[PDB]
Point group: C3
Chain length 195, copies 3
């Protein structure tokens, strides 16, 4: 069912300047936004109109947006989780409600990697890959077979440079951060379309 | 016998434009090229006129050339291998025929690390070093004592931040690849051998 | 702890790049630990007795950008992963520790003050482990005793499964053994003030 492809929209130049100005008037499209500070790149996934990514990529940094920089609405260092108001045009994934243990991690290179959930915030890859297959995909989505968000990719367990299992912030942890709330900008340099 | 030294030729700014334009009018020299996207760096080894490197660094990107960007001539994801037409000026290594297990790995820093081959695509360092010695040297060559290409550095077995063994695409897999068949990757430096 | 810290960014990537090329940094220098960068990677440097020390695996044999142009290395020790420059005017200097305490504190680029238990000449254990990301990019940062004196600089970490448990450092002694025995410039892009 689940397939994906990537689209690069900027170079490092556009990125650098966008970061400095915090002003991105490119058209936002897709559910998964390929994201970057000037010095490191990772993914940001959208759920419930909020654009979620990891703190170990974003920091407390703002998001470059059409009317200037967007301050983080949510920030949870303990859960390695931040979130901005999703910019106009960005599609939002719906949270999973079926309880499927068969998860699908989508990577920055638009690979769809099977995972079996074996814990609340953790699961094993059905076939190990070199860690390069995952690196730079933090803040990417884990999807159930219906393509609903179960959680966002946070870390991976590896040995001898081969990743055997993953760690993610579940979608429930987001609801808990959301309720509990109640120099450079991060830049959208591409996206990953789903289906 | 084997020795090697490095030469940088571009800054990151130079690299950024050369990447976007896709046009590199610099003089290509050496057998091993220090290569970079705008955002990561590794190596590319030339063998029999083909300029090889790793997919996990270069993706499916073109290579900035003196008459515009050059499209990958080979792309084997499963082996983590990509190849371009070697750009004019580059020198080319010849595959090893002597079957030696005494390999020698050349790094981006130009260190010549002795490796004992212990499998088709696998070998051990005679004395371990910190992973930082190797990191960024994917696409670099592993050389027999006579200075010929046996393979191409791909990944490393490390623990506690020290590298003990390596994994490399053998020069035969390249022959199999050859038989079967936004930004450009940029040459920002090179490594001269002897 | 009597020891607390915060960081100040002073440059961005474009600013860093130019300054690397020129090797001329006219920015006013402050604090003991300097956030340091080549164009393509970033780490830390610590001042002890007028000498600004960092890791070779970050700086190599690069000059340091200075107010009257680039500063050649005063000490280089690749066996120990150690390099040092004359501390540029403005830079405050920590003092070597003499109490022989084993209750060390690692300071990171994100201004975290991590407890460590010295368990060897040049090695220690984190009192409570953390994800490796907490340490990455903090090489050349200070390990301090309870009195805020230097015992050594952060060099490497022992990790498994993405969690850092122990660390490896150059002792301050080894620097005194270096002191007796003996294209781009590295650029300061921020600092970390201690107390
Ligand atoms: C308790 O739950 C967790 C659980 C985890 C926590 C945590 O995970 C960070 C993880 C640990 C480390 C890691 O997994 N390995 C070394 C193993 C090999 C690589 C595995 C491949 C991919 C991994 C997803 C990934 C990644 O792609 N990152 S990335 O995109 O490349 C990038 C650096 C942003 C550019 N994540 C990641 O690589 N890294 C950090 C922190 C926090 N860090 C900080 C600051 C100081 C950086 C604050 S919080 N917290 C946590 C909490
Ligand atoms: C079956 O044989 C192999 C066998 C291996 C395969 C594979 O190896 C990638 C390897 C696994 C990981 C790794 O070794 N460690 C974590 C251990 C610590 C570091 C050891 C130091 C240096 C290592 C050589 C090195 C390196 O220098 N890389 S690099 O230059 O710095 C750089 C990021 C590109 C800039 N290689 C590398 O670091 N990494 C990838 C893929 C493919 N990946 C993909 C995409 C999605 C990225 C497609 S194919 N395939 C494979 C196949
Ligand atoms: C004998 O004592 C030691 C002992 C160790 C030696 C050594 O260790 C460097 C260590 C080994 C490797 C490592 O620990 N891991 C992969 C594990 C996961 C990460 C742990 C997190 C943080 C670590 C502190 C740190 C760091 O933050 N680095 S950094 O800032 O990000 C950066 C790349 C510079 C930008 N250091 C570091 O990560 N790395 C290298 C060399 C030498 N290297 C060279 C050249 C060839 C590069 C010359 S010497 N020497 C040594 C000597
Ligand atoms: Cl390691
Ligand atoms: Cl800048
Ligand atoms: Cl923090
Ligand atoms: Cl990390
Ligand atoms: Zn579902
Ligand atoms: Zn030979
Ligand atoms: Zn003391």
């Amino acid at each position: 069912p689940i397939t994906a492809y990537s689209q690069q929209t900027r170079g490092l130049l556009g990125c650098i300047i966008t970061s400095l100005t915090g002003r991105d008037r490119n058209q936002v499209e897709g559910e998964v936004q390929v994201v970057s500070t000037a010095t490191q790149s990772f993914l940001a996934t959208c759920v419930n109109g909020v654009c979620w990514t990891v703190y170990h990529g974003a920091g407390s940094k703002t998001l470059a947006g059409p009317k200037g920089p967007i301050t983080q609405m949510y920030t949870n260092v303990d859960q390695d989780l931040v979130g901005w108001q999703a910019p106009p045009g960005a599609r939002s994934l719906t949270p999973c409600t079926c309880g499927s243990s068969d998860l699908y991690l989508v990577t920055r290179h638009a690979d769809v990697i099977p995972v079996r959930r074996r814990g609340d915030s953790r699961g094993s890859l059905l076939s190990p890959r070199p860690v390069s297959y995952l690196k730079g995909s933090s803040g990417g989505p884990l999807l159930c077979p219906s393509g609903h968000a179960v959680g966002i990719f946070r870390a991976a367990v590896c040995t001898r440079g081969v990743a055997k299992a993953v760690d993610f912030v579940p979608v429930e942890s987001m609801e808990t951060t959301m309720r509990a709330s109640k120099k450079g900008s991060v830049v959208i340099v591409g996206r990953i379309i789903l289906s």
